[PDB]
Write an enzyme that holds these catalytic residues in place. Structure first.
Site, PDB file in Angstrom:
ATOM      1  N   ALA A  32     -13.346  -0.151  -3.895  1.00 49.30           N
ATOM      2  CA  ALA A  32     -12.577  -0.517  -5.093  1.00 49.30           C
ATOM      3  C   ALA A  32     -11.608  -1.684  -4.853  1.00 49.30           C
ATOM      4  O   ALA A  32     -11.349  -2.492  -5.759  1.00 49.30           O
ATOM      5  CB  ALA A  32     -11.832   0.708  -5.641  1.00 49.30           C
ATOM      6  N   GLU A  33     -11.064  -1.778  -3.644  1.00 48.80           N
ATOM      7  CA  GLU A  33     -10.081  -2.829  -3.362  1.00 48.80           C
ATOM      8  C   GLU A  33     -10.733  -4.143  -2.919  1.00 48.80           C
ATOM      9  O   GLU A  33     -10.172  -5.215  -3.120  1.00 48.80           O
ATOM     10  CB  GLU A  33      -9.042  -2.378  -2.323  1.00 48.80           C
ATOM     11  CG  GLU A  33      -9.629  -2.137  -0.959  1.00 48.80           C
ATOM     12  CD  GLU A  33      -8.586  -1.881   0.122  1.00 48.80           C
ATOM     13  OE1 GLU A  33      -7.374  -2.103  -0.105  1.00 48.80           O
ATOM     14  OE2 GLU A  33      -9.005  -1.449   1.212  1.00 48.80           O
TER      15      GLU A  33
ATOM     16  N   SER B  74       0.823  -1.200   0.000  1.00 46.94           N
ATOM     17  CA  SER B  74       0.000   0.000   0.000  1.00 46.94           C
ATOM     18  C   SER B  74       0.859   1.253   0.000  1.00 46.94           C
ATOM     19  O   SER B  74       1.965   1.265   0.553  1.00 46.94           O
ATOM     20  CB  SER B  74      -1.013  -0.018   1.152  1.00 46.94           C
ATOM     21  OG  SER B  74      -0.383  -0.283   2.380  1.00 46.94           O
TER      22      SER B  74
ATOM     23  N   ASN C 101       2.595   4.018   3.121  1.00 47.36           N
ATOM     24  CA  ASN C 101       2.628   3.243   4.354  1.00 47.36           C
ATOM     25  C   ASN C 101       4.083   2.975   4.724  1.00 47.36           C
ATOM     26  O   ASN C 101       4.845   2.401   3.936  1.00 47.36           O
ATOM     27  CB  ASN C 101       1.817   1.950   4.194  1.00 47.36           C
ATOM     28  CG  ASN C 101       1.685   1.171   5.496  1.00 47.36           C
ATOM     29  OD1 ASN C 101       2.664   0.928   6.190  1.00 47.36           O
ATOM     30  ND2 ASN C 101       0.469   0.793   5.827  1.00 47.36           N
TER      31      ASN C 101
ATOM     32  N   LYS D 296     -10.097  -6.502  10.142  1.00 51.83           N
ATOM     33  CA  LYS D 296     -11.310  -6.640  10.948  1.00 51.83           C
ATOM     34  C   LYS D 296     -12.539  -6.916  10.101  1.00 51.83           C
ATOM     35  O   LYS D 296     -13.368  -7.749  10.461  1.00 51.83           O
ATOM     36  CB  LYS D 296     -11.564  -5.402  11.810  1.00 51.83           C
ATOM     37  CG  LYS D 296     -12.852  -5.521  12.631  1.00 51.83           C
ATOM     38  CD  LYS D 296     -13.153  -4.255  13.417  1.00 51.83           C
ATOM     39  CE  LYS D 296     -14.478  -4.390  14.157  1.00 51.83           C
ATOM     40  NZ  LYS D 296     -14.819  -3.159  14.913  1.00 51.83           N
ATOM     41  N   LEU D 297     -12.673  -6.214   8.978  1.00 54.14           N
ATOM     42  CA  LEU D 297     -13.835  -6.442   8.131  1.00 54.14           C
ATOM     43  C   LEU D 297     -13.859  -7.902   7.678  1.00 54.14           C
ATOM     44  O   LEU D 297     -14.908  -8.543   7.640  1.00 54.14           O
ATOM     45  CB  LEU D 297     -13.837  -5.467   6.949  1.00 54.14           C
ATOM     46  CG  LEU D 297     -15.170  -5.307   6.221  1.00 54.14           C
ATOM     47  CD1 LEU D 297     -15.327  -3.914   5.641  1.00 54.14           C
ATOM     48  CD2 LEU D 297     -15.275  -6.344   5.142  1.00 54.14           C
TER      49      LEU D 297
END
Length: 215
Positions: free
Chosen positions: A163-164, A26, A29, A189-190
């Site tokens: 989008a990801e 990413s 980061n 977490k999702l």
């Protein structure tokens, strides 16, 4: 030289077979120094039969815009950072015998049937299901991470999450590989919520999530 933890037991079964790993890198980061990218890719190539890399698509600009960066400048900054991410990944893949061309951004498939179909599923859930929408906004909050984060900021940032997400639930549909793990150094977490069947959105049986940590 990396420790791993999988999201589900099914993820662990994919892990054991070692077919393919999709290494997430990413932009902006601090984890992703050139040296870290080289070590992580060297590890991936050693451990898995095939290695691919996933970079941020165009919606990364939303994260910058949410932090007050004008849109034009945000687009240019993302292009610069993502091109940099790519150059490090290319060099590492070449050096360890991988394929430097197997690097994708989450925007590369905007007109592909598989990707579009997954976008549609995620978007439908986002608008239909309050619980899913809130989980996504929370994911987008994490993506942005003293500036106070506002609701309007997250409504902008969450396009990035939308989008990801197809690559988090069904990257093999998009990339044409038999099965994969998305490998990344943060917890997801999702994904934990998705694995407990809390949403209309499901992770495919040939998709896993692999959290990696330096050993």
């Amino acid at each position: 030289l990396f420790k791993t933890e999988t999201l589900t037991q099914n993820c662990n079964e994919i892990l054991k077979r070692r077919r393919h790993v999709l290494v997430g890198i990413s932009p902006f980061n601090s984890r992703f120094s050139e040296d870290y990218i080289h070590r992580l890719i060297a590890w991936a190539v050693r451990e898995f039969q095939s290695v691919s890399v996933l970079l941020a698509g165009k919606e990364a600009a939303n994260l910058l815009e949410a932090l007050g960066t004008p849109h034009g400048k945000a687009e240019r900054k993302v292009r610069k950072e993502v091109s940099r991410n790519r150059r490090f990944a290319e060099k590492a893949l070449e050096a360890h015998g991988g394929n430097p061309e197997d690097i994708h951004t989450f925007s590369d498939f905007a007109n592909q049937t598989a990707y579009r179909n997954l976008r549609m599923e995620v978007e439908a859930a986002f608008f239909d299901q309050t619980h899913f929408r809130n989980a996504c906004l929370e994911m987008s909050h994490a993506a942005i991470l003293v500036v106070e984060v506002s609701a309007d900021m997250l409504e902008l940032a969450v396009e990035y999450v939308i989008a990801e997400l197809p690559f988090f639930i069904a990257a093999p549909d998009i990339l044409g590989v038999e099965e994969t793990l998305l490998a990344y150094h943060r917890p997801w977490k999702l994904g934990e919520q998705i694995s407990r069947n809390e949403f209309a959105v499901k992770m495919r049986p040939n998709q896993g999530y692999l959290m990696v940590s330096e050993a």
